[PDB]
């Protein structure tokens with residue numbers, strides 16, 4: 005009884021979001037999952053398959069993932085899935101002795117670390133958003149989203165490479181890979197102490213279905229597979245990811261619109277005089293002085309607009325054109 | 339090094355007639371499947387959807403049909419498995435009694451949780467043990483893989499101990515009696531249920547928990563925020579809105595179970611008094627190996643355990659061939 009309250013008080017309280025009319029605070033894709041693809045999924049659905057325990061990493065889903073990665077060195081043994089990239093990170097924290105990340109970073113790193121009671125360390129990035137000096141080695145997992153959350157800034161190659169050389173296991177969280185070009189998947193050829201985490205959540209408009217995947221060494225994937233829940237991804241969720249990848253041209257078009265919308269907003273913000281990051285994610289970040297930031301949030305709240313607030317300022321997710329314009333119009337006049 | 343305490347993952351090719359995973363024998367209804375996609379909002383697939391959704395809690399509550407539980411007493415997991423997995427991250431030590439669910443050992447090792455396996459007595463009764471606050475005791479009732487039911491007294495004794503009881507009612511629909519009413523006295527209890535067996539929804543991963551508000555609150559802070567997909571929650575909701583179609587299937591399942599139980603006894607086999615959706619046949623290992631091979635020859639798969647085989651109830655035909663097979667054996 006008493007120790008359970010001790011469990012609480014150690015982790016952040018569970019809360020749910022109350023979405024405003026124009027929600028741009030969770031990096032969700034602006035467009036719904038394509039309706040004809042939902043119908044495709046409905047049609048490929050074998051009602052008899054619902055009653056069975058369905059191989060979470062589906063054999064054909066791995067194939068599609070491989071296909072998508074389009075490398076010449078990967079095999080099914082280098083890939084696995086997660087109930088969202090969230091679970092991959094979560095279980096990864098169960099696997100290593102200590103988790104290491106650098107704020108500003110994906111806020112769930114801290115939450116999940118405290119949730120599972122894992123030992124972790126937060127070393128802040130330089131004022132230049134560069135990876136600080138740190139003492140890590142085999143035993144630690146270093147979580148590096150890249151593009152970074154919520155800055156969306158892209159780290160330099162020697163930066164990851166440095167951590168990589170320390171023998172520490174790097175978990176390159178490529179949650180925003182799709183909205184940026186590069187990917188360190190190829191690095192899997194030189195380093196074994198690395199894992200690339202992806203999701204269907206941002207570019208495939210499937211955040212509600214929870215599908216993440218990991219590309220890494222056979223030894224890691226095997227380890228991961230022994231630690232994760234056996235059936236972590238539903239038959240229907242996998243079906244959504246497979247259909248999704250069968251029509252990637254569709255989402256390539258949406259991603260292009262998102263990026264073209266990101267740069268448009270980034271340009272407009274500079275013109276207005278705001279300090280912003282060189283975000284390669286599906287969002288933009290604005291540096292603001294607390295007091296002027298708070299003033300901006302109150303104004304936006306008055307207009308049913310929700311963005312993500314941060315110590316450094318605000319993170320704005322890219323939405324539909326009329327939402328992006330709205331953000332610009334309210335920022336202009338303020 | 340990335341050691342793993344040697345315990346791989348894999349699912350060999352399921353034989354044609356698969357009776358080894360306590361899976362419902364019937365497909366999810368075609369029309370409920372239709373209803374699910376009917377209520378499917380495409381715009382909601384792109385957002386992060388409250389896993390324990392509000393309507394899902396209302397439905398569950400309604401299905402539990404009690405006079406005290408409120409929304410605060412219920413939560414959900416990505417399969418009953420996830421609820422077990424997270425609970426093991428919440429307590430100092432996990433205690434369970436073999437023969438018991440094989441995944442308790444697996445998830446504990448996997449989650450690095452301290453655990454103690456104390457075998458049930460020779461009469462399948464909860465053994466005497468030193469447990470109290472800090473400890474969490476997993477008791478499936480009906481038990482897996484025997485299907486036998488533990489007496490209320492048994493559960494209560496562990497409860498008085500002050501240790502937390504994780505009452506695993508994965509097979510409840512086939513038994514008919516829950517100890518969820520115990521939440522009126524003990525706060526150190528959680529009942530766990532699933533949609534995988536009685537609702538032919540094993541593939542969609544939806545489990546749920548009924549416990550004290552303090553426990554629900556701590557559980558909700560340790561689990562993944564969005565552990566149950568939007569569509570999975572829809573599937574559970576429609577299943578509950580048509581709960582009578584599954585009670586019919588379940589009635590059939592139990593008939594079949596009792597029918598096989600009489601025939602096996604008659605044939606001379608020693609069995610447990612299973613109240614789940616399967617039977618348990620005791621077999622002296624060597625001969626068991628014989629059956630397994632034989633069945634392997636007929637494309638038939640059952641589950642093998644140290645004391646025998648657990649055969650899941652399938653369609654009337656599958657059951658018939660099973661009785662016939664055990665007969666000619």
Ligand SMILES: Cc1ncc(COP(=O)(O)O)c(CNC(COP(=O)(O)O)Cc2c[nH]cn2)c1O
Nearest residue numbers: 359417418419439440478482508532534544545
């Ligand atoms: C007693 C018990 N508790 C929980 C579960 C989980 O059900 P879900 O996660 O689908 O909601 C189960 C399910 N049992 C099996 C078979 O068990 P065994 O043959 O390993 O002893 C199905 C299963 C689930 N995860 C792996 N296998 C049970 O029985």
Ligand SMILES: Cc1ncc(COP(=O)(O)O)c(CN[C@@H](COP(=O)(O)O)Cc2c[nH]cn2)c1O
Nearest residue numbers: 030088089090110111149153179203205215216
């Ligand atoms: C860096 C990073 N990694 C993983 C994920 C999630 O992947 P999945 O959806 O497959 O689990 C995210 C997503 N970011 C979210 C917004 O973060 P914020 O609360 O700090 O603004 C969405 C989210 C998902 N769970 C909680 N929040 C990510 O950015």
